[PDB]
Write an enzyme that holds these catalytic residues in place. Structure first.
Site, PDB file in Angstrom:
ATOM      1  N   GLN A   1      55.609 -25.525  41.224  1.00  0.00           N
ATOM      2  CA  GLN A   1      55.877 -25.865  42.618  1.00  0.00           C
ATOM      3  C   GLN A   1      57.360 -25.862  42.874  1.00  0.00           C
ATOM      4  O   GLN A   1      58.141 -25.792  41.902  1.00  0.00           O
ATOM      5  CB  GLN A   1      55.286 -27.219  42.964  1.00  0.00           C
ATOM      6  CG  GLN A   1      53.821 -27.168  43.261  1.00  0.00           C
ATOM      7  CD  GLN A   1      53.190 -28.522  43.205  1.00  0.00           C
ATOM      8  OE1 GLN A   1      52.680 -29.076  44.188  1.00  0.00           O
ATOM      9  NE2 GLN A   1      53.189 -29.065  42.034  1.00  0.00           N
ATOM     10  N   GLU A   2      57.739 -25.937  44.202  1.00  0.00           N
ATOM     11  CA  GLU A   2      59.104 -25.956  44.793  1.00  0.00           C
ATOM     12  C   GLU A   2      60.064 -25.023  44.065  1.00  0.00           C
ATOM     13  O   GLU A   2      61.175 -25.428  43.753  1.00  0.00           O
ATOM     14  CB  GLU A   2      59.711 -27.392  44.886  1.00  0.00           C
ATOM     15  CG  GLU A   2      58.958 -28.407  45.741  1.00  0.00           C
ATOM     16  CD  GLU A   2      59.127 -28.354  47.245  1.00  0.00           C
ATOM     17  OE1 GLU A   2      59.891 -27.493  47.746  1.00  0.00           O
ATOM     18  OE2 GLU A   2      58.479 -29.181  47.927  1.00  0.00           O
ATOM     19  N   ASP A   3      59.619 -23.798  43.757  1.00  0.00           N
ATOM     20  CA  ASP A   3      60.368 -22.749  43.046  1.00  0.00           C
ATOM     21  C   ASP A   3      60.456 -22.799  41.524  1.00  0.00           C
ATOM     22  O   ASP A   3      61.324 -22.156  40.971  1.00  0.00           O
ATOM     23  CB  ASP A   3      61.712 -22.381  43.707  1.00  0.00           C
ATOM     24  CG  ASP A   3      61.531 -21.960  45.133  1.00  0.00           C
ATOM     25  OD1 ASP A   3      60.702 -21.043  45.378  1.00  0.00           O
ATOM     26  OD2 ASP A   3      62.130 -22.613  46.024  1.00  0.00           O
ATOM     27  N   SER A   4      59.532 -23.493  40.843  1.00  0.00           N
ATOM     28  CA  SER A   4      59.428 -23.465  39.383  1.00  0.00           C
ATOM     29  C   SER A   4      58.529 -22.246  39.089  1.00  0.00           C
ATOM     30  O   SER A   4      57.982 -21.630  40.021  1.00  0.00           O
ATOM     31  CB  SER A   4      58.704 -24.712  38.866  1.00  0.00           C
ATOM     32  OG  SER A   4      59.460 -25.909  38.774  1.00  0.00           O
ATOM     33  N   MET A   5      58.340 -21.915  37.798  1.00  0.00           N
ATOM     34  CA  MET A   5      57.400 -20.881  37.343  1.00  0.00           C
ATOM     35  C   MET A   5      56.823 -21.235  35.984  1.00  0.00           C
ATOM     36  O   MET A   5      57.450 -21.975  35.242  1.00  0.00           O
ATOM     37  CB  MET A   5      57.923 -19.429  37.416  1.00  0.00           C
ATOM     38  CG  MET A   5      59.435 -19.280  37.452  1.00  0.00           C
ATOM     39  SD  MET A   5      59.968 -17.571  37.126  1.00  0.00           S
ATOM     40  CE  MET A   5      59.392 -17.424  35.439  1.00  0.00           C
TER      41      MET A   5
END
Ligand SMILES: [Zn+2]
Ligand SMILES: [Zn+2]
Ligand SMILES: [Zn+2]
Lengths: 263, 46, 65, 134, 114
Positions: free
Chosen positions: D2-6
């Protein structure tokens, strides 16, 4: 015979396509995961670099060395070094490989997995021989050399599982499907005009009866019939990837039964 | 084979005291690379 | 910089297939897609491995030292 | 993720996905000036000096330099040098406090002024970890 | 740098034990079992088998954090029936199913050609 049932559709040295019926999905999946992660194998776990005048870095070479598939047929007759009473490593817990290559020719000199030499005592166990599936019998290009170039190194191949490093997977893709007709309604299909027209029919649909539109939903039904295909890297024959997979899982349940006893 | 300094230009194995400047014997280039240890490096093949 | 041994995604050994691939392309004058299939590179993760590989080692071997 | 993690696959990382080499060159020369006053590339000991770093100088050969192939980490002195104070004064170069790796290539040459000057290349292999950007 | 060793996934630490049985505080005849150095492979398989038992009132597992191998298993059984016995039978049932599979695959494999 009793519980789970197997039907082999296709079989070769490299693959097994089979139907697993009268089984629970928890079992089919736990088995699936064990073949990926937990079947012990032999792979290069230590490289000592004497000479590297090669164009590639020591650790770059060492990395690919660990990735070469090695005979793991008689792996249960080899100890995990961590359990072995030796100081470091020995013939009871490791296989030692040698790599000496020099650029003799003006033309490029290729270095293969066929060029590793077993230097330790195998004690008649079928282990450590690099796996060669190549037609030319070379198998796995480790490196390439120019004229004055040299590579002199020594490898310690140890026992391990993919859970610690992927190089220890007898693995390769595990094709796994159940209910090709979506009779179970385990997936809700994404469509534009027609999910049937838009989603390609599974080859496994031949092996099952279509739902038939004039029938109410089978709410009580459960998944039992898993269409699988286990691909082998080479280190262990396919039959063994599955048999040892079954054996390992059986073993790790037994360690729980024994743990309950101990307390 | 007491390797101290290899020539960066001709790959000639050589060596000399800090009182003999830089330069190469039978090449004359002032480049020079230090010889790899004999200590031997161990790697986990990971 | 040299054929990866094994496909990153699935683990299929690919490091023994490069030279055979070049031959399939050159000698047999086949297309990349049929060359890949003849090698037994059925899935796209294994196909990207070889088709997408850039062999800089050839360039590196050109440096005289 | 989420919120730009991978979420990255560890198994494919084990097989080499997004793995990279890292190189860092450290430079030094024997002084800038002094007709009789010249800095020296050497392995420094006592000789009243006391201005040492330590960070073990123990990986240095008699020329004040580490041989390619030696493992370096922490603040291990990679180039040993002294300033003549009229006894010795430390001018040694430690490896970047946070860095580690293997000495890759050690270049010993001369500047246009006739200065003994050195370049030390150190090599790390960076494997994709949790806060890495892609 | 702050990465744990990969053996910490399957190797018990000094002080760590495979099973740790705690009596549940919320319900009668319920127990919580912490399984160290084990994941979804054992957890799913065991939980599924316990539900196949008519004297098992509750069976669920969870892996509270992906960083750690451990999982927690909650079993609630019928008055008279002990959760440890329920876990025992579940295990033997799995082992007997696995034994049956090994032989059935071996039988099939022998009939094959290639
Ligand atoms: Zn041993
Ligand atoms: Zn020269
Ligand atoms: Zn693949």
């Amino acid at each position: 015979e009793e519980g789970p049932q197997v039907k082999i559709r296709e079989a070769s040295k490299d693959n097994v396509d089979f139907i697993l019926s009268n089984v629970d999905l928890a079992m089919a999946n736990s088995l699936r995961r064990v073949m990926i992660a937990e079947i012990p194998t032999l792979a290069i776990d230590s490289v000592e670099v004497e000479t590297n005048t090669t164009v590639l870095a020591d650790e770059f070479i060492a990395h690919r060395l660990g990735l070469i598939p090695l005979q793991s047929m008689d792996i249960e007759q080899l100890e995990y070094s961590r359990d072995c009473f030796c100081e470091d490593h020995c013939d009871k817990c490791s296989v030692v490989l040698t790599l000496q290559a020099f650029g003799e020719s003006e033309s490029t000199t290729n270095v293969y997995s066929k060029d590793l030499v077993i230097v330790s005592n195998l004690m008649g166990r079928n282990i450590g021989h690099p796996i060669i599936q190549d037609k030319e019998g070379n198998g796995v290009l480790i490196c390439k050399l120019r004229k004055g170039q040299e590579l002199k190194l020594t490898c310690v191949a140890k026992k391990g599982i993919a859970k610690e490093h992927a190089k220890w997977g007898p693995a390769a893709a595990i094709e796994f499907e159940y209910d090709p007709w979506n009779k179970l309604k385990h997936t809700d299909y994404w469509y534009e005009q027609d999910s049937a027209k838009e989603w390609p029919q599974s080859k496994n649909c031949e092996y099952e009866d279509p739902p038939n539109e004039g029938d109410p939903f089978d709410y009580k039904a459960q998944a039992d019939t898993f269409y699988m295909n286990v691909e082998s890297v080479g280190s262990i024959p396919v039959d063994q990837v599955v048999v040892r997979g079954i054996d390992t899982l059986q073993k790790k349940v037994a360690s729980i039964l024994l743990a309950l006893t101990q307390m | 084979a007491t390797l101290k300094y290899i020539c960066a230009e001709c790959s000639s194995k050589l060596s000399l005291s800090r009182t003999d400047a830089v330069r190469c014997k039978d090449c004359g280039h002032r480049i020079l690379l230090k010889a790899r240890t004999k200590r031997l490096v161990q790697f986990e093949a990971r | 910089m040299i054929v990866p041994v094994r496909c990153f995604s699935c683990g299929k050994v690919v490091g023994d297939k490069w030279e055979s691939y070049l031959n399939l392309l050159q000698e047999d004058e086949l297309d990349e897609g049929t060359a890949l299939s003849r090698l037994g590179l059925k899935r796209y993760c294994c196909r990207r491995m070889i088709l997408t590989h850039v062999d800089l080692i050839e360039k590196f071997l050109r440096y005289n030292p | 993720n989420q919120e730009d993690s991978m979420i990255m696959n560890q198994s494919s990382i084990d097989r080499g996905l997004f793995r990279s080499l890292f190189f860092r060159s450290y430079m030094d020369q024997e002084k800038k000036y002094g007709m009789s006053i010249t800095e020296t590339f050497e392995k420094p000991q006592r000789t009243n000096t006391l201005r040492m770093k330590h960070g073990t100088y123990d990986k240095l050969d008699d020329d004040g330099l580490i041989a390619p192939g030696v493992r370096v980490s922490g603040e291990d002195v990679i180039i040993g040098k002294t300033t003549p104070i009229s006894s010795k004064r430390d001018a040694s170069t430690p490896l970047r406090s946070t860095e580690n790796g293997i000495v890759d290539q050690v270049l010993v040459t001369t500047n246009q002024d006739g200065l003994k000057f050195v370049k030390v290349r150190v090599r790390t292999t960076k494997i994709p970890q949790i806060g890495d950007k892609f | 740098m702050n990465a744990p060793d990969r053996f910490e996934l399957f190797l018990l630490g000094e002080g760590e034990s495979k099973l740790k049985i705690d009596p549940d505080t919320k319900a009668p005849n319920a127990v919580v079992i912490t399984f160290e150095k084990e994941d979804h492979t054992l957890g799913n398989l065991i939980r599924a088998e316990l539900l196949n038992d008519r004297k098992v009132l509750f069976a669920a597992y969870k892996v509270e954090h992906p960083f750690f191998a451990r999982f927690k298993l909650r079993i609630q059984t019928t008055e008279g029936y002990d959760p440890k016995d329920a876990l025992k039978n579940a295990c033997n049932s799995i082992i007997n199913k696995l034994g049956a599979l090994k032989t059935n695959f071996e039988t099939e494999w022998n009939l094959q050609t290639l």
